[PDB]
């Protein structure tokens, strides 16, 4: 997706980045909503830290660098 569209990332943003960000937002919102109901905030803090670390690992392993600043935001 980076190679096509001739770095130019028009195809990458139009096809993959936006949808991936939308599903990430929906999944994280649902996870936070379902976790805050039963378990207390003390475990939610550790879960949030672990999720942030996992997302950083994913974005630095198999995602483009241009998504590093947006997703972490």
């Amino acid at each position: 997706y980076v190679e096509l569209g001739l770095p130019t990332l028009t195809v990458y943003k139009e096809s993959f980045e936006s949808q991936f960000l939308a599903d990430t937002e929906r999944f994280y919102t649902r996870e936070s909503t379902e976790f805050l109901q039963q378990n207390p905030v003390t475990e939610y803090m550790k879960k949030a830290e672990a999720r942030l670390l996992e997302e950083q690992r994913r974005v630095q392993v198999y995602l483009h660098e241009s998504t590093q600043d947006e997703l972490a935001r």
Partner: protein
């Protein structure tokens, strides 16, 4: 301008104090705020004038000049700074004491202002001769103070002058004056932090050679000070310090204090040591050393305090502590003066804190040793000192907190002590507060049965404590009264106690506090909570005061201060076994509670919703319409996708209202229904809230109302679809299934859905998908075996151009089979073998049935399903193999005892495909939450991992994947098998030159590697091991392999960089020992160049790898003591761009 400076300089010599003070203040405030264009001659005159004014005969002018000297040196040429420093230095040696003090203060101010290098060098050169052993004690003191301040302010510079500083400081340790010794000890401690690395060796050698001579406590104090200020550096000398100190433990002179302190400091700072029993015995024997007139008490204090470091710092020595005399002597030794008793009690508090959890467990030993502590506390409770009683109460509270129920047989002896402490007049407020807290903690953490005989002896003290002008004690008494009320009349257990004689008093002490009349807010809240608890528990015994006191609840509801407390009290009162008559109050309360929904308070919203729900549930025969629409007027705002919890509570309230009051169900046809429909299609809709809505729908369908029938609901639900997210389709299907379940006589609906699904003409993909989902959801509960044309149309829907319809048909094929397994399961089982062009969706449907069907109903067909899966294990298609393995793994969950041996026995002679399927199937059995199969998996994972770690390539890959999944999900299974598995992983983490097949075409090359996947899986396992399995592993055997993988394939390079970044924070010392061999590959990564004539993408692909290496080395540079620079200062034009991009 120059004229202003000239006139200030002229007036500075007016011989009049007021003129001399105003001009100096003006000069200071002008220099403090951006002095403009000050010519060099002006600097000269200003410096000379200030230096002369420092010798003036009035203190005010000298002090103002001293303060002004600071902001002056901010902006002056360096030569004036040098001459000012020189003048201060020579004035410091003047005979006049005022000049010495003024110069010292000025030099201290200059040093504090300075953040520059030559000034400090000159000052140090002067002070080195100043501190030398001369006949002026005051000059030595001032020079020592100045050098100590300079070292504290900055120590990075003066690297070459440190040996001279040490050489001048060392002889001062034997000076007759003790103040000189203390000051030079402080100076040496400050100097140690700055240093270079060699100087500590000479300092330690000098201390060691001085100690083995005519000794003095000054050397021991200096050793303790430098060890406190620098712990890690002096660790290597622990073997050469302890025996010499121990040799001095037998001196009759009372110098054991210093030894005890340096031991305490060492244990606080330096944890690695193996001489604990000897020092523990020394401390124990020194603790009982007694033989105001005799000075033998600070030794006991130090000995008792030293045990605190041992107890708190060490956690793995708890059984050793409990079994030895560590707590036994402390419990026995509780009769001493106030300070020693207090510090011993603090040590025992630390011991109890360490006992708190993160054959003979520490809790069991503490329980066994409880009686001695109880006897000691009972004996110590008769003292007249409030501090001892406070310490005893803290001990009791901590002992109850660490383990509940410990004080079960000790209540009859502990209660008299608490009663005496509460009834004593000399007791302070703090003692009463902590005694009440301890009593509350004991009552809350023990059975009510043991407290019954003492109930007569516990009520008058608490009642007296209620009537106290101090509000804190009153609040504590109310808190204790709540637990007393709970204990005397429990509702979850049968009790024969008669609490009637204690009723009125408990009311009398409370109702007066209920009428606040400008009292503390916390007192109001506690009184309201206690009054509500009294209503909930002892309402029957109350007479005619209930209607009068019920209005106070409304009054406390009116104001904002106690809204939440009153709401909680009313909710507790409503939900009680005793049906309290709240009807007279409910009529006024309901509108007030409903009005609270408008304001944006989440906690208040939830509280008032729960209160309304419980009130309408308990009381349904006293409701009027007006309160109903008053409550429902604010519901539509509360139903939104933004807040799922509030929507769920509103749905539950609506369901309860429909259940109890179905008459007023015609007012929800407006905005409420629209909001509910909008929430139905919300993608975030999930969880029990969804279920709640389903329940609500069912209830409504049970009631029956105009424009709210089954057909109207179906039309409203399926309007937009028949005329976008998949979760909306699933929610609509579930709602349709629930509505169908509400009315069993709905046969035509299924046939209509069948006609809609089978009619190809004028049918969109969305309509077919919705119909398939609805049919699958409906058939999940009710039987559809008597209806024909199902299997034919479902199998026809498999051949569709859209994958959504294919997935929906595959899911819905086995959904009806859940209701009727015997008719449908053999059909799909036979269709799997009969038709090979659709067996993928058939296997998916079979997996769905296995996941969904009941275990007791699926037991008879387990053998057939297992036989079919084993026959289909060897297939040409990979996806079919994965589906079969997943089905086997899910089937393994049920009846594991019978079938786990069967999968166990296939490892002996199974084929490569069979072994791979077996390893893959067990992967799906591991779950994050605990499962009943956990011990079996723990006991049989050993051969799945160890014995089958290198039969072949694909088997190795699947075994590594299973190990990674197990480590990520349940590390406990592989916690004890790391030792026998890690060498195999390290073997897997090596490059092999037999699976690299190079394909060459002209001047171009294309390397193809087969075992990249195995290495990547091994590296992923290694990365996952850091999360929870990092403590029990050899760090070097991980770091050398990390270095080896640093030069691996491009994909693994980023993972290795991430591992290096993670290890930068975790265990910095191990990285420090390997910082020289962890950068050379990282330096090659930032230097490598690619051959020309390559594609443009090949040019940019190193442009992220080099950036990642730059980030990794930048993270590695964050180690506090990573000062070593392996030719790092090589920044040409191209490389230097990367720093700022990384930052």
């Amino acid at each position: 301008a120059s004229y202003h400076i000239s006139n200030l300089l002229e007036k500075m010599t007016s011989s009049d104090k007021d003129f001399r003070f105003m001009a100096t203040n003006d000069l200071m405030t002008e220099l403090q705020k951006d002095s403009i264009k000050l010519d060099d001659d002006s600097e000269r005159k200003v410096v000379k004038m200030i230096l002369k004014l420092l010798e003036d005969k009035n203190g005010e002018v000298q002090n103002l000049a001293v303060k002004c000297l600071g902001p002056l040196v901010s902006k002056v040429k360096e030569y004036q700074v040098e001459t000012i420093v020189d003048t201060l230095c020579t004035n410091m040696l003047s005979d006049k004491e005022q000049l010495r003090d003024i110069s010292s203060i000025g030099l201290k101010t200059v040093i504090g202002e300075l953040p520059a290098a030559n000034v400090c060098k000159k000052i140090t050169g002067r002070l080195t001769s100043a501190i030398a052993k001369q006949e002026d004690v005051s000059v030595q003191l001032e020079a020592l103070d100045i050098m100590a301040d300079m070292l504290s302010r900055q120590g990075g510079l003066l690297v070459n002058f440190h040996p001279s500083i040490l050489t001048c400081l060392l002889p001062q340790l034997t000076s007759p004056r003790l103040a000189v010794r203390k000051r030079t000890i402080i100076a040496l401690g400050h100097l140690v932090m700055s240093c270079f690395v060699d100087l500590i060796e000479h300092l330690l050698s000098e201390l060691s050679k001085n100690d083995s001579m005519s000794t003095t406590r000054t050397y021991i104090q200096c050793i303790a000070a430098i060890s406190r200020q620098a712990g890690h550096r002096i660790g290597e000398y622990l073997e050469k310090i302890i025996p010499l100190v121990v040799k001095f433990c037998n001196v009759d002179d009372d110098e054991l204090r210093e030894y005890c302190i340096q031991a305490f400091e060492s244990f606080v700072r330096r944890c690695p040591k193996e001489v604990y029993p000897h020092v523990s015995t020394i401390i124990n024997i020194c603790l009982k050393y007694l033989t105001d007139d005799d000075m033998s008490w600070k030794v006991r204090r130090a000995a008792a305090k030293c045990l605190d470091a041992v107890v708190s710092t060490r956690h793995e020595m708890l059984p050793e502590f409990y079994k030895t005399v560590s707590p036994a002597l402390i419990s026995r030794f509780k009769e001493r003066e106030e300070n020693v008793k207090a510090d011993v009690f603090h040590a025992y508090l630390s011991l109890l804190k360490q006992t708190r959890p993160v054959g003979e467990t520490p809790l069991t030993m503490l329980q066994s040793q409880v009686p001695n502590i109880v006897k000691a506390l009972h004996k110590q409770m008769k003292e007249k000192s409030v501090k001892t009683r406070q310490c005893c109460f803290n001990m009791l509270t901590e002992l109850v907190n660490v383990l509940p129920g410990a004080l079960t047989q000790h209540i009859p002896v502990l209660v008299p002590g608490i009663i005496f402490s509460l009834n004593d007049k000399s007791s302070s407020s703090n003692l009463k507060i902590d005694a009440l807290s301890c009593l509350y903690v004991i009552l809350c953490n023990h059975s009510p049965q043991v407290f019954h005989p003492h109930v007569q002896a516990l009520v008058p003290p608490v009642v007296a404590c209620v009537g106290d002008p101090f509000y804190k004690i009153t609040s504590e008494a109310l808190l204790v009264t709540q637990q007393l009320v709970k204990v005397i009349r429990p509702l979850d257990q049968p009790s024969s106690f008669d609490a009637t004689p204690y009723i009125k008093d408990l009311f009398t002490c409370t109702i007066k506090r209920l009428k606040a009349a400008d009292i503390d807010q916390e007192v109001k809240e506690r009184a309201i909570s206690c009054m509500g608890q009294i209503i909930c528990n002892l309402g029957d015994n109350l007479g005619s005061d209930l209607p009068n006191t019920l209005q106070i609840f409304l009054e406390r509801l009116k104001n904002e201060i106690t809204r939440l407390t009153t709401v909680k009290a009313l909710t507790l009162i409503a939900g009680s076994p005793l049906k309290i008559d709240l009807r007279p109050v409910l009529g006024e309360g309901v509108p007030i509670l409903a009005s609270f929904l408008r304001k944006n308070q989440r906690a208040l919203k939830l509280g008032t919703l729960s209160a309304l729900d419980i009130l309408i549930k308990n009381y349904s025969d006293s409701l009027t319409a007006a309160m109903i629409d008053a409550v429902l007027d604010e519901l539509p705002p509360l139903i939104s996708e933004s807040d799922m919890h509030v929507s769920q509570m509103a749905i539950s309230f609506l369901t309860t209202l429909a259940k109890v009051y179905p008459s007023s169900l015609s007012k929800i046809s407006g905005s409420i229904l629209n909001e509910l429909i909008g929430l139905v299609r919300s993608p975030l809709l999930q969880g029990g809230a969804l279920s709640a809505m389903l329940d609500f729908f069912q209830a409504l369908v049970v009631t029956g109302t105009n424009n709210l029938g089954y057909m109207d609901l179906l039309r409203m639900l399926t309007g937009p679809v028949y005329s976008t997210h998949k979760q909306s389709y699933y929610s609509i299907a579930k709602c349709v299934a629930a509505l169908t379940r509400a009315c069993p006589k709905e046969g035509p609906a299924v046939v209509g859905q069948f006609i809609q699904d089978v009619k190809n003409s004028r049918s969109t993909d969305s309509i077919r998908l919705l119909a398939l989902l609805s049919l699958g959801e409906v058939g999940h509960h009710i039987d559809l075996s008597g209806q024909l044309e199902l299997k034919s149309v479902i199998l026809e829907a498999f051949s569709s151009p859209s994958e959504e319809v294919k997935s929906a048909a595959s899911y819905a094929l086995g959904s009806i089979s859940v209701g009727n397994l015997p008719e449908y399961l053999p059909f799909v089982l036979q269709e799997i073998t009969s038709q090979p062009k659709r067996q993928y969706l058939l296997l998916h449907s079979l997996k769905e049935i296995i996941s969904s069907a009941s275990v007791v109903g699926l037991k008879p067909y387990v053998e057939n399903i297992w036989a079919l899966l084993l026959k289909h294990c060897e297939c040409a298609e990979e996806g079919t193999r994965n589906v079969v393995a997943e089905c086997l793994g899910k089937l393994t969950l049920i009846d594991p005892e019978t079938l786990l041996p069967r999968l166990k026995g296939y490892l002996i002679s199974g084929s490569s495909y069979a072994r791979s399927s077996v390893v893959t199937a067990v992967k799906f059995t591991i779950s994050d939450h605990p499962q009943p199969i956990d011990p079996l998996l723990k006991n049989c994972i050993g051969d799945f991992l160890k014995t089958l770690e290198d039969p072949d390539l694909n088997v190795r890959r699947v075994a590594l994947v299973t190990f990674n999944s197990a480590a990520h999900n349940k590390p406990s299974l592989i916690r004890d098998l790391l030792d026998t598995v890690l060498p195999h992983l390290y073997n897997e983490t090596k490059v092999r030159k037999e699976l690299i097949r190079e394909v060459e075409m002209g001047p171009f090359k294309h390397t193809v590697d087969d075992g990249l996947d195995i290495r990547k899986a091994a590296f992923e396992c290694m990365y996952t091991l850091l999360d929870s399995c990092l403590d029990r592993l050899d760090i070097f055997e991980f770091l050398n392999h990390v270095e080896d993988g640093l030069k691996d394939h491009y994909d693994i390079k980023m993972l290795t960089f991430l591992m290096l970044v993670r290890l930068s924070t975790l265990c910095p010392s191990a990285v420090l020992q390997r910082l020289d061999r962890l950068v050379e590959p990282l330096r090659a990564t930032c230097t490598t160049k690619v051959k020309a004539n390559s594609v443009k993408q090949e040019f940019e692909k190193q442009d992220e790898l080099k950036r990642s290496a730059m980030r990794a080395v930048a993270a590695l540079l964050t180690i506090p003591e990573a000062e070593k620079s392996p030719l790092m200062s090589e920044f040409q034009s191209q490389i230097s761009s990367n720093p700022e991009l990384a930052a």
